[PDB]
Structure 1
């Protein structure tokens, strides 16, 4: 009769991969209604807002996620990406470096994604 938070997150994940970003973000919003203390729902929605060029909305969701999970690699990484697109280069680099440190501490492996993002951000700061 009613979807669980997990059903809604799964539906949002499918819409995200399907390039339906506003629809995915709304699904994560419905998951948040059901369980508002889960940081992943906010970081997932932040990534949707990034793909929608809605940087202020993405930044707010990263901040919410960080209140719920201060160790979140993705909250720091997406926050850094947000700030990079808003030309806040020093803050972007700090958050990407923090994502690097947290990923190493948590033994996560994203390939060279985080160092590559750092190089991109430093080059953009210099080129601007």
Structure 2
């Protein structure tokens, strides 16, 4: 049912994403956001997969969507910052990495992936 439908796209999309088939894994997690739309993981993995095929325009939106279902998902912010970085919205990516450190007061990705925003 509508619960197990959300795991089906998790396992099936994950087994594609870890195999390097990010494009195939997107179409999996897509079914779950349309079946449930309440787990922040489904949009977070679709965002990561889009970010692995340099679709930062699509991965910005799916990172935002994961933050709308959770609000406390520090990874969904760091992922959004990595999208907005290579999208040219570098200063918007900073506003996302500065958040990751509120939710994780030692995050090495939030210190490092943010340092790229500030460099020449």
* Coarse TM-score class (shorter-chain normalised): 0.7 to 0.9
Moved over 3 A (4+): none
Residue deviations 1:56-106 (CA, integer Å, cap 9, x gap): 2111112222221111112111110111101222111121111122123xx
Q: Which residue of 1 aligns with 2:55?
A: 54
Q: TM-score, normalised by structure 2?
A: 0.86
Partner residue, 2:101: 100
CA distance in 2, matches of 1:38, 1:115: 27
State the TM-score, normalized to the length of structure 1: 0.82
Shift of 1:21: 0.6
What does 1:55-94 correspond to in 2, within 5 Å?
55-94=56-95
2:113 corresponds to which of 114, 117, 125: 117
Q: CA deviation at 1:120?
A: 2.2
- Where 1:75 maps in the other structure, the secondary structure is helix
- Let me know the Cα RMSD of the aligned residues: 1.7
CA distance in 1, matches of 2:53, 2:111: 24
Unaligned runs of 5+ in 1: none
Per-residue deviation at 1:113? Answer: 2.5
The number of residues matched between the two structures is: 117
Structure 2 distance, partners of 1:120, 1:91, is 13
User: Cα distance, 1:121 vs. partner?
Assistant: 2.4
